[PDB]
Design an enzyme around this catalytic site. Structure first.
Site, PDB file in Angstrom:
ATOM      1  CG  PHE A  66      15.611  36.614  46.054  1.00  0.00           C
ATOM      2  CD1 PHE A  66      14.330  36.346  46.276  1.00  0.00           C
ATOM      3  CD2 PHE A  66      15.823  38.042  45.882  1.00  0.00           C
ATOM      4  CE1 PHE A  66      13.426  37.324  46.491  1.00  0.00           C
ATOM      5  CE2 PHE A  66      15.124  38.982  45.715  1.00  0.00           C
ATOM      6  CZ  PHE A  66      13.553  38.752  46.059  1.00  0.00           C
ATOM      7  NE  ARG A 114      18.833  35.047  51.140  1.00  0.00           N
ATOM      8  CZ  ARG A 114      19.278  35.332  50.156  1.00  0.00           C
ATOM      9  NH1 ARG A 114      19.194  34.909  48.755  1.00  0.00           N
ATOM     10  NH2 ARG A 114      20.119  36.568  50.087  1.00  0.00           N
ATOM     11  CB  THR A 116      22.456  33.148  49.106  1.00  0.00           C
ATOM     12  OG1 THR A 116      21.391  33.715  49.731  1.00  0.00           O
ATOM     13  CG2 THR A 116      22.695  33.977  47.745  1.00  0.00           C
ATOM     14  CB  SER A 134      22.090  32.021  43.295  1.00  0.00           C
ATOM     15  OG  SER A 134      21.281  33.233  43.177  1.00  0.00           O
TER      16      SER A 134
END
Lengths: 248, 248
Positions: free
Chosen positions: A191, A233, A189, A50
């Site tokens: 993932f 994270r 963010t 992302s």
């Protein structure tokens, strides 16, 4: 281009606390003054996930596929991978919740000729878009390092990407995640998946922090095989930034 | 104007609770759909005080006096009237702590001719800047109504002021006070002083709220003769906006 980076191993002590493999790159003022816990990993390229909807948004606007910052992206009713994407979203809204399908449609409209050219201008990673224009940043061949991410975000912060100042500023407001008097964070963010244990996926946190008259750029990535480890994270780079006097 | 405004006296409850003479104006989407507690006060004109830092910031950038968004306003070490101002500040910092002496210096450099012109292009109140270039918004003849504030904030949201879009965007980033995934607030306070009790001072809170894909514009002012009343400039509009289900 230019980039002065020092390895510092005392930082490894919050990765070890939680038995993690990853890298943190932190820069004060500019890329002329950076530190990392692992110089080799810092320069190693991984799947953006992302974190790619930062460059993707800019390109959207440069090309006209995104009309302007007030454009609304309507849900069509046909269900989606997660509920929190089942609704209309503003440009900002979609980035903040990581709404893959909005960006899939942006990318199809944009088209690989254009996507390739812009990733060239941005010096974004290996610039390998191949393996389907629908998902190259999710399970395709595009890779970028933490160092490259920091350089890219610094360019963006300064309005030096090959794009109107206008579009850079739009995308920057979409990234704000914390706003206090004299303390501002811009963040994204990422993932990829738990992958497997043979080949674990990657988690990211990238962005920058304005505090008083100072700015810190950062990028963090870690190997991930277990979805419950995902909060790290944030908490690892947070604790590192705390020890340097930053967060607070 | 195309301003369409409806008086709704139910809102008077949160004011008489506290014996406050004041006015709240709330618009959904545009100035075509506005509500207020008190139609007369809605159109009455008051000293803008620090809410004036919004136009002032825009004109500073437009005239070149403020170089760009990264300019740092240096403290010279000399005493300033509040301790939160005795430090170097960014543009956002100055705005967010209402650093009056930063904006006074800006304004002296813009000069009377350029200030007059931009207040005319923006339709900013009675556009009267007489009685000292570096204090007309604090104690001089300038006046604006809540209605006019809402029409001004609206043009700024849409990027329709006579100013570059990039300068508008820069100022909008400086005004962010709250940032969540699908919930963005831009706002600014002001306080002229305690006036007398014969002739009260005024306190303001103005701004807008992006919730999901909806936007609400707002302006609040109240009579004030006592500094301890000051938190009501936020707490009253807050309660009204909650009863309409905007925040919360």
């Amino acid at each position: 281009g230019h980039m002065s980076i020092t390895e510092n191993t005392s930082w490894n002590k919050e990765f070890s606390a939680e038995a993690v493999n990853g890298v943190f790159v932190l820069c004060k003022s500019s890329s002329k003054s950076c530190a990392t816990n692992d110089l080799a990993r810092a320069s190693k390229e991984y799947l953006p996930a992302s974190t790619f909807k930062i460059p993707n948004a800019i390109i959207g606007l440069e090309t006209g596929v995104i009309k302007n910052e007030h454009q609304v992206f309507k849900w069509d009713g046909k269900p989606r991978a997660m509920k929190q994407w089942e609704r209309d979203l503003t440009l900002r809204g979609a980035i903040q919740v990581s709404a893959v399908p909005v960006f899939q449609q942006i990318t199809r409209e944009v088209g690989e000729v254009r996507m390739q050219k812009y990733l060239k201008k941005f010096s974004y990673g290996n610039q390998n878009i191949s393996g389907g224009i629908d998902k190259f940043w999710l399970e395709g061949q595009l890779r970028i390092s933490a160092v490259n991410q920091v350089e890219f975000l610094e360019s963006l912060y300064l309005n030096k990407l090959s794009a109107s100042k206008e579009n850079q500023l739009i995308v920057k407001e979409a990234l704000v995640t914390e706003a206090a008097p004299e303390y501002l964070v811009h963040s994204k963010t990422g993932f990829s998946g738990v992958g497997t244990e043979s080949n674990p996926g990657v988690a990211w946190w990238v962005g920058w922090v304005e505090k008083e008259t100072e700015v810190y750029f950062f990028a963090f990535n870690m190997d991930i095989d277990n979805e419950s480890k995902l909060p790290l994270r944030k908490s690892i780079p947070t604790k590192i930034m705390e020890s340097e006097g930053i967060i607070g």
